[PDB]
Amino acid sequence: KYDTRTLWTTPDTSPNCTIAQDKDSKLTLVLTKCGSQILANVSLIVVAGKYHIINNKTNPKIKSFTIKLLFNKNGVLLDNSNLGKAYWNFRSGNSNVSTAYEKAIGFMPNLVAYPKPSNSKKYARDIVYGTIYLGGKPDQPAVIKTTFNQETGCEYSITFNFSWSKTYENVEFETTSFTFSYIAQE
Amino acid sequence: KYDTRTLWTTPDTSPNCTIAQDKDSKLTLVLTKCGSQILANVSLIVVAGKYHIINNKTNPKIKSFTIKLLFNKNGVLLDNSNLGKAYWNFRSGNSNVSTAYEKAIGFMPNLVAYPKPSNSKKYARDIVYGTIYLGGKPDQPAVIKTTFNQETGCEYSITFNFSWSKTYENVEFETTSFTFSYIAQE
Amino acid sequence: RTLWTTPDTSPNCTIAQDKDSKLTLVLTKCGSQILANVSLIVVAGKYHIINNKTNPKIKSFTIKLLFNKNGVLLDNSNLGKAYWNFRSGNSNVSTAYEKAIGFMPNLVAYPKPSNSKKYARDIVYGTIYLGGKPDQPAVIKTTFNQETGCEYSITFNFSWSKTYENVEFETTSFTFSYIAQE
Ligand SMILES: CC(=O)N[C@H]1[C@H]([C@H](O)[C@H](O)CO)O[C@@](OCCn2cc(CN(Cc3cn(CCO[C@]4(C(=O)O)C[C@H](O)[C@@H](NC(C)=O)[C@H]([C@H](O)[C@H](O)CO)O4)nn3)Cc3cn(CCO[C@]4(C(=O)O)C[C@H](O)[C@@H](NC(C)=O)[C@H]([C@H](O)[C@H](O)CO)O4)nn3)nn2)(C(=O)O)C[C@@H]1O
Ligand SMILES: [Cl-]
Ligand SMILES: [Mg+2]
Ligand SMILES: [Mg+2]
Ligand SMILES: [Mg+2]
Ligand SMILES: [Zn+2]
Ligand SMILES: [Zn+2]
Ligand SMILES: [Zn+2]
Ligand SMILES: [Zn+2]
Ligand SMILES: [Zn+2]
Ligand SMILES: [Zn+2]
Ligand SMILES: [Zn+2]
């Protein structure tokens, strides 16, 4: 059956995301609608390019990057997002429904909770911080900062900024999972 | 909506909470019922009075404060709570249903999991800890400690204690969001 | 919709000796994701009172839940089967469940051990606090489907790095989620 309460990337490892080069990563993102809140589960695997293997010995200034999901007024993912549109859809089993969705407003971050930009200092409640671990190692933390509706050129957005303090020496950027939630638009 | 699965403060910024003076803050709290667990999402904006701008040079020992939600046997908010009664109801759209609810036991913290204070041994599982960030700045952590059913003068309670260890100088007390869950009474 | 240990404090888990602990675990199915809430009370034995001045090398322990093709708990799990069932009130359904595959950790998200690249996404880390004291953290590492001799697994490793002196191992609560098998 069509799982109309889940919007996801599918849980496979095929690259679906472009951070620095085309399809250099798998963002695994599952949004499950529990009424007024979306329960969100996220991880990242970088498979190629600039962020695949971190070396802060050779490149000490490379300490963060950003993955943006931008949505229009109907909750449809915009082309300029880092996440590709071909496997972002409602769930069917371990895959997606066949028809590209036309409406997902119920999965969008609430605009009264998280107003869009701006020319307006905004309240911090539109941010959630967490920590994930590279390679599952407990001494390899990175910060995942999630921000709602702070991108311009869209109606809604979810942004993930990944950052770290440690001087990583050939560490592959693939992460443990993090769960959060946010208030839904409808 | 008439969303009988969500009890909330609404997502607006109208001050609804009294910490040190009348309506000096907006507590944004959303309780969403996923069967036997309540999914909770919380943030705080202090808009005026003593806790609005922290200055620990002027006030070295102001390092914490508490917001309490106290409930009767039917799950109805009691007026000694810091959150105002007019701001707390079942969801309708971005607003509240027009008349106060009579029962919300399904939203109350489970008394077997989290007993009221008594002569019996108190267990730590009635607490959840998280860290939120003032102004969304990653060097401005504060701890949110949430405690279930540990107030007297009520049948159920949810208490939020906000505290910090750093010496903050002119830092605005408005927070990022935190998600947690707890076991429901019914 | 809810698989759980019941929320009472009667011991149901064997870490170092028979029924030395109460694992309170609640798994609620929100569709494609399981919402999980976990805490631990150790009541007796080696892990009840931590004293790292006396015993410097007692710094971690593991609790394993092993499941077969049907989502049924295998009896070599640390958690006892008598206690683990679908909710009815504050107790359990009268009969033992035959099926809960919809509560199992998804095997494409979280594959069993293999001879291919092993990804970290099958781990969730959190911190809980012993005695509810903010200066007594311990790490709770949760891992999906990485045990052998089972179809599915959930494992909780508890560890700490501070030198605790006479600290009772009873934790605050931690919530996490994971992608469901179906
Ligand atoms: C409830 C609660 O929160 N309790 C905490 C209490 C409590 O606040 C007080 O007791 C009051 O009640 O405090 C604990 O800490 C006591 C204080 N303490 C002692 C130490 C040793 N060092 C020192 C240190 C300090 N800094 C400051 C920079 O840090 C921040 C900041 O700017 O303030 C913290 C922010 O949260 C962070 N922001 C974000 C968004 O993340 C920022 C940010 O990153 C930067 O600003 C950049 O923008 O930074 N730095 N050092 C702290 C310390 C401890 N270690 C041990 C080794 O570290 C790790 C590791 O990397 O290996 C961390 C890792 O996450 C962890 N892994 C896991 C899975 O948990 C591992 C692991 O435990 C071991 O490796 C074993 O495998 O350890 N290094 N440096 N710091 N603070 C307390 O009382 O114990 C903590 C308690 O939770
Ligand atoms: Cl009022
Ligand atoms: Mg909705
Ligand atoms: Mg102490
Ligand atoms: Mg299912
Ligand atoms: Zn790689
Ligand atoms: Zn297009
Ligand atoms: Zn290491
Ligand atoms: Zn302000
Ligand atoms: Zn001001
Ligand atoms: Zn600063
Ligand atoms: Zn004890």
JSON list of N, CA, C and O in Angstrom, two decimals, chain A residues 55-101:
[
{"chain": "A", "resi": 55, "resn": "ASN", "atom": "N", "xyz": [40.61, 15.29, 5.75]},
{"chain": "A", "resi": 55, "resn": "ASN", "atom": "CA", "xyz": [41.97, 15.40, 6.22]},
{"chain": "A", "resi": 55, "resn": "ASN", "atom": "C", "xyz": [42.27, 16.86, 6.55]},
{"chain": "A", "resi": 55, "resn": "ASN", "atom": "O", "xyz": [42.58, 17.66, 5.65]},
{"chain": "A", "resi": 56, "resn": "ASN", "atom": "N", "xyz": [42.16, 17.16, 7.84]},
{"chain": "A", "resi": 56, "resn": "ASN", "atom": "CA", "xyz": [42.42, 18.46, 8.39]},
{"chain": "A", "resi": 56, "resn": "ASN", "atom": "C", "xyz": [43.90, 18.71, 8.68]},
{"chain": "A", "resi": 56, "resn": "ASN", "atom": "O", "xyz": [44.27, 19.80, 9.11]},
{"chain": "A", "resi": 57, "resn": "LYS", "atom": "N", "xyz": [44.75, 17.71, 8.44]},
{"chain": "A", "resi": 57, "resn": "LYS", "atom": "CA", "xyz": [46.18, 17.95, 8.34]},
{"chain": "A", "resi": 57, "resn": "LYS", "atom": "C", "xyz": [46.53, 18.71, 7.06]},
{"chain": "A", "resi": 57, "resn": "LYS", "atom": "O", "xyz": [47.24, 19.71, 7.06]},
{"chain": "A", "resi": 58, "resn": "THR", "atom": "N", "xyz": [46.05, 18.20, 5.93]},
{"chain": "A", "resi": 58, "resn": "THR", "atom": "CA", "xyz": [46.33, 18.78, 4.64]},
{"chain": "A", "resi": 58, "resn": "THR", "atom": "C", "xyz": [45.39, 19.97, 4.40]},
{"chain": "A", "resi": 58, "resn": "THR", "atom": "O", "xyz": [45.79, 20.99, 3.82]},
{"chain": "A", "resi": 59, "resn": "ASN", "atom": "N", "xyz": [44.16, 19.87, 4.91]},
{"chain": "A", "resi": 59, "resn": "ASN", "atom": "CA", "xyz": [43.14, 20.90, 4.73]},
{"chain": "A", "resi": 59, "resn": "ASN", "atom": "C", "xyz": [42.49, 21.35, 6.04]},
{"chain": "A", "resi": 59, "resn": "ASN", "atom": "O", "xyz": [41.31, 21.08, 6.28]},
{"chain": "A", "resi": 60, "resn": "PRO", "atom": "N", "xyz": [43.25, 22.08, 6.88]},
{"chain": "A", "resi": 60, "resn": "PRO", "atom": "CA", "xyz": [42.71, 22.44, 8.20]},
{"chain": "A", "resi": 60, "resn": "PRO", "atom": "C", "xyz": [41.50, 23.38, 8.18]},
{"chain": "A", "resi": 60, "resn": "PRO", "atom": "O", "xyz": [40.85, 23.48, 9.20]},
{"chain": "A", "resi": 61, "resn": "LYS", "atom": "N", "xyz": [41.21, 24.04, 7.06]},
{"chain": "A", "resi": 61, "resn": "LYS", "atom": "CA", "xyz": [40.09, 24.98, 7.02]},
{"chain": "A", "resi": 61, "resn": "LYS", "atom": "C", "xyz": [38.77, 24.35, 6.59]},
{"chain": "A", "resi": 61, "resn": "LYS", "atom": "O", "xyz": [37.73, 24.99, 6.66]},
{"chain": "A", "resi": 62, "resn": "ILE", "atom": "N", "xyz": [38.80, 23.10, 6.17]},
{"chain": "A", "resi": 62, "resn": "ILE", "atom": "CA", "xyz": [37.59, 22.39, 5.80]},
{"chain": "A", "resi": 62, "resn": "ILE", "atom": "C", "xyz": [36.94, 21.76, 7.04]},
{"chain": "A", "resi": 62, "resn": "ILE", "atom": "O", "xyz": [37.29, 20.64, 7.45]},
{"chain": "A", "resi": 63, "resn": "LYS", "atom": "N", "xyz": [35.98, 22.49, 7.62]},
{"chain": "A", "resi": 63, "resn": "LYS", "atom": "CA", "xyz": [35.40, 22.13, 8.91]},
{"chain": "A", "resi": 63, "resn": "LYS", "atom": "C", "xyz": [33.88, 22.13, 8.95]},
{"chain": "A", "resi": 63, "resn": "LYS", "atom": "O", "xyz": [33.30, 21.95, 10.02]},
{"chain": "A", "resi": 64, "resn": "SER", "atom": "N", "xyz": [33.24, 22.37, 7.81]},
{"chain": "A", "resi": 64, "resn": "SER", "atom": "CA", "xyz": [31.77, 22.34, 7.73]},
{"chain": "A", "resi": 64, "resn": "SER", "atom": "C", "xyz": [31.26, 22.30, 6.29]},
{"chain": "A", "resi": 64, "resn": "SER", "atom": "O", "xyz": [31.98, 22.62, 5.37]},
{"chain": "A", "resi": 65, "resn": "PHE", "atom": "N", "xyz": [30.01, 21.89, 6.12]},
{"chain": "A", "resi": 65, "resn": "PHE", "atom": "CA", "xyz": [29.32, 21.99, 4.84]},
{"chain": "A", "resi": 65, "resn": "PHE", "atom": "C", "xyz": [27.81, 21.92, 5.09]},
{"chain": "A", "resi": 65, "resn": "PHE", "atom": "O", "xyz": [27.38, 21.60, 6.23]},
{"chain": "A", "resi": 66, "resn": "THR", "atom": "N", "xyz": [27.02, 22.23, 4.06]},
{"chain": "A", "resi": 66, "resn": "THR", "atom": "CA", "xyz": [25.58, 22.41, 4.24]},
{"chain": "A", "resi": 66, "resn": "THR", "atom": "C", "xyz": [24.82, 21.66, 3.17]},
{"chain": "A", "resi": 66, "resn": "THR", "atom": "O", "xyz": [25.21, 21.66, 2.03]},
{"chain": "A", "resi": 67, "resn": "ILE", "atom": "N", "xyz": [23.73, 21.01, 3.57]},
{"chain": "A", "resi": 67, "resn": "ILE", "atom": "CA", "xyz": [22.85, 20.31, 2.65]},
{"chain": "A", "resi": 67, "resn": "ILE", "atom": "C", "xyz": [21.48, 20.96, 2.80]},
{"chain": "A", "resi": 67, "resn": "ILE", "atom": "O", "xyz": [20.96, 21.01, 3.91]},
{"chain": "A", "resi": 68, "resn": "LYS", "atom": "N", "xyz": [20.91, 21.47, 1.72]},
{"chain": "A", "resi": 68, "resn": "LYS", "atom": "CA", "xyz": [19.67, 22.24, 1.76]},
{"chain": "A", "resi": 68, "resn": "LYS", "atom": "C", "xyz": [18.54, 21.51, 1.04]},
{"chain": "A", "resi": 68, "resn": "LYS", "atom": "O", "xyz": [18.72, 21.08, -0.08]},
{"chain": "A", "resi": 69, "resn": "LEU", "atom": "N", "xyz": [17.38, 21.38, 1.69]},
{"chain": "A", "resi": 69, "resn": "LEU", "atom": "CA", "xyz": [16.15, 20.94, 1.04]},
{"chain": "A", "resi": 69, "resn": "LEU", "atom": "C", "xyz": [15.22, 22.14, 0.99]},
{"chain": "A", "resi": 69, "resn": "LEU", "atom": "O", "xyz": [14.80, 22.64, 2.04]},
{"chain": "A", "resi": 70, "resn": "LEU", "atom": "N", "xyz": [14.91, 22.59, -0.22]},
{"chain": "A", "resi": 70, "resn": "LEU", "atom": "CA", "xyz": [14.05, 23.74, -0.44]},
{"chain": "A", "resi": 70, "resn": "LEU", "atom": "C", "xyz": [12.74, 23.24, -1.03]},
{"chain": "A", "resi": 70, "resn": "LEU", "atom": "O", "xyz": [12.76, 22.38, -1.93]},
{"chain": "A", "resi": 71, "resn": "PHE", "atom": "N", "xyz": [11.63, 23.81, -0.55]},
{"chain": "A", "resi": 71, "resn": "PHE", "atom": "CA", "xyz": [10.28, 23.42, -1.00]},
{"chain": "A", "resi": 71, "resn": "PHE", "atom": "C", "xyz": [9.41, 24.58, -1.45]},
{"chain": "A", "resi": 71, "resn": "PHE", "atom": "O", "xyz": [9.47, 25.71, -0.90]},
{"chain": "A", "resi": 72, "resn": "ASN", "atom": "N", "xyz": [8.57, 24.33, -2.43]},
{"chain": "A", "resi": 72, "resn": "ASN", "atom": "CA", "xyz": [7.65, 25.36, -2.90]},
{"chain": "A", "resi": 72, "resn": "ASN", "atom": "C", "xyz": [6.40, 25.43, -2.03]},
{"chain": "A", "resi": 72, "resn": "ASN", "atom": "O", "xyz": [6.34, 24.75, -0.99]},
{"chain": "A", "resi": 73, "resn": "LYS", "atom": "N", "xyz": [5.41, 26.21, -2.44]},
{"chain": "A", "resi": 73, "resn": "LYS", "atom": "CA", "xyz": [4.16, 26.36, -1.65]},
{"chain": "A", "resi": 73, "resn": "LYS", "atom": "C", "xyz": [3.34, 25.06, -1.43]},
{"chain": "A", "resi": 73, "resn": "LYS", "atom": "O", "xyz": [2.54, 24.98, -0.48]},
{"chain": "A", "resi": 74, "resn": "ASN", "atom": "N", "xyz": [3.55, 24.06, -2.29]},
{"chain": "A", "resi": 74, "resn": "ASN", "atom": "CA", "xyz": [2.86, 22.76, -2.15]},
{"chain": "A", "resi": 74, "resn": "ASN", "atom": "C", "xyz": [3.69, 21.67, -1.48]},
{"chain": "A", "resi": 74, "resn": "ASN", "atom": "O", "xyz": [3.27, 20.51, -1.39]},
{"chain": "A", "resi": 75, "resn": "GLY", "atom": "N", "xyz": [4.86, 22.06, -0.98]},
{"chain": "A", "resi": 75, "resn": "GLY", "atom": "CA", "xyz": [5.72, 21.16, -0.25]},
{"chain": "A", "resi": 75, "resn": "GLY", "atom": "C", "xyz": [6.55, 20.30, -1.18]},
{"chain": "A", "resi": 75, "resn": "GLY", "atom": "O", "xyz": [7.13, 19.32, -0.73]},
{"chain": "A", "resi": 76, "resn": "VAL", "atom": "N", "xyz": [6.62, 20.69, -2.45]},
{"chain": "A", "resi": 76, "resn": "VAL", "atom": "CA", "xyz": [7.38, 19.97, -3.48]},
{"chain": "A", "resi": 76, "resn": "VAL", "atom": "C", "xyz": [8.83, 20.46, -3.44]},
{"chain": "A", "resi": 76, "resn": "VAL", "atom": "O", "xyz": [9.08, 21.68, -3.36]},
{"chain": "A", "resi": 77, "resn": "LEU", "atom": "N", "xyz": [9.77, 19.51, -3.51]},
{"chain": "A", "resi": 77, "resn": "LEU", "atom": "CA", "xyz": [11.20, 19.80, -3.43]},
{"chain": "A", "resi": 77, "resn": "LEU", "atom": "C", "xyz": [11.68, 20.58, -4.68]},
{"chain": "A", "resi": 77, "resn": "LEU", "atom": "O", "xyz": [11.38, 20.19, -5.80]},
{"chain": "A", "resi": 78, "resn": "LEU", "atom": "N", "xyz": [12.38, 21.68, -4.47]},
{"chain": "A", "resi": 78, "resn": "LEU", "atom": "CA", "xyz": [12.86, 22.51, -5.57]},
{"chain": "A", "resi": 78, "resn": "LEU", "atom": "C", "xyz": [14.15, 21.92, -6.11]},
{"chain": "A", "resi": 78, "resn": "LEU", "atom": "O", "xyz": [14.94, 21.33, -5.35]},
{"chain": "A", "resi": 79, "resn": "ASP", "atom": "N", "xyz": [14.37, 22.13, -7.42]},
{"chain": "A", "resi": 79, "resn": "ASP", "atom": "CA", "xyz": [15.48, 21.59, -8.21]},
{"chain": "A", "resi": 79, "resn": "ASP", "atom": "C", "xyz": [16.85, 21.99, -7.70]},
{"chain": "A", "resi": 79, "resn": "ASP", "atom": "O", "xyz": [17.80, 21.27, -7.93]},
{"chain": "A", "resi": 80, "resn": "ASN", "atom": "N", "xyz": [16.94, 23.18, -7.10]},
{"chain": "A", "resi": 80, "resn": "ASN", "atom": "CA", "xyz": [18.20, 23.72, -6.60]},
{"chain": "A", "resi": 80, "resn": "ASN", "atom": "C", "xyz": [18.59, 23.13, -5.27]},
{"chain": "A", "resi": 80, "resn": "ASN", "atom": "O", "xyz": [19.64, 23.47, -4.76]},
{"chain": "A", "resi": 81, "resn": "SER", "atom": "N", "xyz": [17.75, 22.29, -4.67]},
{"chain": "A", "resi": 81, "resn": "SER", "atom": "CA", "xyz": [18.13, 21.60, -3.43]},
{"chain": "A", "resi": 81, "resn": "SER", "atom": "C", "xyz": [19.35, 20.70, -3.68]},
{"chain": "A", "resi": 81, "resn": "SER", "atom": "O", "xyz": [19.61, 20.29, -4.80]},
{"chain": "A", "resi": 82, "resn": "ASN", "atom": "N", "xyz": [20.10, 20.42, -2.62]},
{"chain": "A", "resi": 82, "resn": "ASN", "atom": "CA", "xyz": [21.19, 19.45, -2.68]},
{"chain": "A", "resi": 82, "resn": "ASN", "atom": "C", "xyz": [20.67, 18.04, -2.84]},
{"chain": "A", "resi": 82, "resn": "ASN", "atom": "O", "xyz": [21.28, 17.22, -3.54]},
{"chain": "A", "resi": 83, "resn": "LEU", "atom": "N", "xyz": [19.55, 17.74, -2.19]},
{"chain": "A", "resi": 83, "resn": "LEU", "atom": "CA", "xyz": [18.89, 16.44, -2.33]},
{"chain": "A", "resi": 83, "resn": "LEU", "atom": "C", "xyz": [18.24, 16.40, -3.70]},
{"chain": "A", "resi": 83, "resn": "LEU", "atom": "O", "xyz": [17.58, 17.34, -4.09]},
{"chain": "A", "resi": 84, "resn": "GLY", "atom": "N", "xyz": [18.42, 15.29, -4.41]},
{"chain": "A", "resi": 84, "resn": "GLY", "atom": "CA", "xyz": [17.86, 15.11, -5.75]},
{"chain": "A", "resi": 84, "resn": "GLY", "atom": "C", "xyz": [16.39, 14.75, -5.62]},
{"chain": "A", "resi": 84, "resn": "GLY", "atom": "O", "xyz": [15.95, 14.25, -4.59]},
{"chain": "A", "resi": 85, "resn": "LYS", "atom": "N", "xyz": [15.63, 15.05, -6.65]},
{"chain": "A", "resi": 85, "resn": "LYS", "atom": "CA", "xyz": [14.16, 14.88, -6.64]},
{"chain": "A", "resi": 85, "resn": "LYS", "atom": "C", "xyz": [13.71, 13.48, -7.03]},
{"chain": "A", "resi": 85, "resn": "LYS", "atom": "O", "xyz": [12.59, 13.10, -6.72]},
{"chain": "A", "resi": 86, "resn": "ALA", "atom": "N", "xyz": [14.57, 12.72, -7.71]},
{"chain": "A", "resi": 86, "resn": "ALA", "atom": "CA", "xyz": [14.17, 11.43, -8.27]},
{"chain": "A", "resi": 86, "resn": "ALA", "atom": "C", "xyz": [13.82, 10.36, -7.20]},
{"chain": "A", "resi": 86, "resn": "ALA", "atom": "O", "xyz": [13.01, 9.49, -7.47]},
{"chain": "A", "resi": 87, "resn": "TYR", "atom": "N", "xyz": [14.39, 10.43, -6.00]},
{"chain": "A", "resi": 87, "resn": "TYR", "atom": "CA", "xyz": [14.02, 9.43, -4.97]},
{"chain": "A", "resi": 87, "resn": "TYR", "atom": "C", "xyz": [13.55, 10.03, -3.65]},
{"chain": "A", "resi": 87, "resn": "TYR", "atom": "O", "xyz": [13.61, 9.38, -2.63]},
{"chain": "A", "resi": 88, "resn": "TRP", "atom": "N", "xyz": [13.02, 11.24, -3.72]},
{"chain": "A", "resi": 88, "resn": "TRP", "atom": "CA", "xyz": [12.31, 11.89, -2.63]},
{"chain": "A", "resi": 88, "resn": "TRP", "atom": "C", "xyz": [10.83, 11.84, -2.92]},
{"chain": "A", "resi": 88, "resn": "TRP", "atom": "O", "xyz": [10.32, 12.58, -3.78]},
{"chain": "A", "resi": 89, "resn": "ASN", "atom": "N", "xyz": [10.12, 10.95, -2.22]},
{"chain": "A", "resi": 89, "resn": "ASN", "atom": "CA", "xyz": [8.69, 10.76, -2.46]},
{"chain": "A", "resi": 89, "resn": "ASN", "atom": "C", "xyz": [8.04, 10.03, -1.28]},
{"chain": "A", "resi": 89, "resn": "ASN", "atom": "O", "xyz": [8.74, 9.68, -0.33]},
{"chain": "A", "resi": 90, "resn": "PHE", "atom": "N", "xyz": [6.72, 9.84, -1.32]},
{"chain": "A", "resi": 90, "resn": "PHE", "atom": "CA", "xyz": [6.03, 9.00, -0.32]},
{"chain": "A", "resi": 90, "resn": "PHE", "atom": "C", "xyz": [6.46, 7.55, -0.42]},
{"chain": "A", "resi": 90, "resn": "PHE", "atom": "O", "xyz": [6.80, 7.06, -1.51]},
{"chain": "A", "resi": 91, "resn": "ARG", "atom": "N", "xyz": [6.45, 6.87, 0.71]},
{"chain": "A", "resi": 91, "resn": "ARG", "atom": "CA", "xyz": [6.98, 5.52, 0.79]},
{"chain": "A", "resi": 91, "resn": "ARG", "atom": "C", "xyz": [6.02, 4.47, 0.26]},
{"chain": "A", "resi": 91, "resn": "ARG", "atom": "O", "xyz": [4.79, 4.57, 0.40]},
{"chain": "A", "resi": 92, "resn": "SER", "atom": "N", "xyz": [6.62, 3.44, -0.33]},
{"chain": "A", "resi": 92, "resn": "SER", "atom": "CA", "xyz": [5.96, 2.21, -0.67]},
{"chain": "A", "resi": 92, "resn": "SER", "atom": "C", "xyz": [6.97, 1.08, -0.39]},
{"chain": "A", "resi": 92, "resn": "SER", "atom": "O", "xyz": [7.92, 0.87, -1.17]},
{"chain": "A", "resi": 93, "resn": "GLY", "atom": "N", "xyz": [6.78, 0.37, 0.73]},
{"chain": "A", "resi": 93, "resn": "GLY", "atom": "CA", "xyz": [7.69, -0.70, 1.11]},
{"chain": "A", "resi": 93, "resn": "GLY", "atom": "C", "xyz": [9.06, -0.11, 1.42]},
{"chain": "A", "resi": 93, "resn": "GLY", "atom": "O", "xyz": [9.18, 0.82, 2.22]},
{"chain": "A", "resi": 94, "resn": "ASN", "atom": "N", "xyz": [10.10, -0.64, 0.78]},
{"chain": "A", "resi": 94, "resn": "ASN", "atom": "CA", "xyz": [11.43, -0.08, 0.91]},
{"chain": "A", "resi": 94, "resn": "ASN", "atom": "C", "xyz": [11.73, 0.87, -0.24]},
{"chain": "A", "resi": 94, "resn": "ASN", "atom": "O", "xyz": [12.86, 1.32, -0.41]},
{"chain": "A", "resi": 95, "resn": "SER", "atom": "N", "xyz": [10.69, 1.20, -1.00]},
{"chain": "A", "resi": 95, "resn": "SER", "atom": "CA", "xyz": [10.84, 2.04, -2.16]},
{"chain": "A", "resi": 95, "resn": "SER", "atom": "C", "xyz": [9.91, 3.26, -2.05]},
{"chain": "A", "resi": 95, "resn": "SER", "atom": "O", "xyz": [9.51, 3.65, -0.95]},
{"chain": "A", "resi": 96, "resn": "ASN", "atom": "N", "xyz": [9.57, 3.86, -3.19]},
{"chain": "A", "resi": 96, "resn": "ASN", "atom": "CA", "xyz": [8.67, 5.02, -3.23]},
{"chain": "A", "resi": 96, "resn": "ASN", "atom": "C", "xyz": [7.44, 4.74, -4.07]},
{"chain": "A", "resi": 96, "resn": "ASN", "atom": "O", "xyz": [7.47, 3.88, -4.95]},
{"chain": "A", "resi": 97, "resn": "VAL", "atom": "N", "xyz": [6.36, 5.47, -3.84]},
{"chain": "A", "resi": 97, "resn": "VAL", "atom": "CA", "xyz": [5.21, 5.41, -4.75]},
{"chain": "A", "resi": 97, "resn": "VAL", "atom": "C", "xyz": [5.69, 5.90, -6.13]},
{"chain": "A", "resi": 97, "resn": "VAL", "atom": "O", "xyz": [6.67, 6.66, -6.24]},
{"chain": "A", "resi": 98, "resn": "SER", "atom": "N", "xyz": [4.98, 5.48, -7.16]},
{"chain": "A", "resi": 98, "resn": "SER", "atom": "CA", "xyz": [5.39, 5.73, -8.55]},
{"chain": "A", "resi": 98, "resn": "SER", "atom": "C", "xyz": [5.19, 7.17, -9.05]},
{"chain": "A", "resi": 98, "resn": "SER", "atom": "O", "xyz": [5.99, 7.68, -9.83]},
{"chain": "A", "resi": 99, "resn": "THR", "atom": "N", "xyz": [4.11, 7.80, -8.61]},
{"chain": "A", "resi": 99, "resn": "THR", "atom": "CA", "xyz": [3.77, 9.14, -9.05]},
{"chain": "A", "resi": 99, "resn": "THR", "atom": "C", "xyz": [4.48, 10.15, -8.16]},
{"chain": "A", "resi": 99, "resn": "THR", "atom": "O", "xyz": [4.41, 10.06, -6.94]},
{"chain": "A", "resi": 100, "resn": "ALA", "atom": "N", "xyz": [5.21, 11.07, -8.77]},
{"chain": "A", "resi": 100, "resn": "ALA", "atom": "CA", "xyz": [5.88, 12.14, -8.04]},
{"chain": "A", "resi": 100, "resn": "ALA", "atom": "C", "xyz": [4.82, 12.97, -7.27]},
{"chain": "A", "resi": 100, "resn": "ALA", "atom": "O", "xyz": [3.87, 13.45, -7.87]},
{"chain": "A", "resi": 101, "resn": "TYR", "atom": "N", "xyz": [4.96, 13.13, -5.96]},
{"chain": "A", "resi": 101, "resn": "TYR", "atom": "CA", "xyz": [3.88, 13.78, -5.22]},
{"chain": "A", "resi": 101, "resn": "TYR", "atom": "C", "xyz": [3.65, 15.22, -5.68]},
{"chain": "A", "resi": 101, "resn": "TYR", "atom": "O", "xyz": [4.58, 15.89, -6.13]}
]
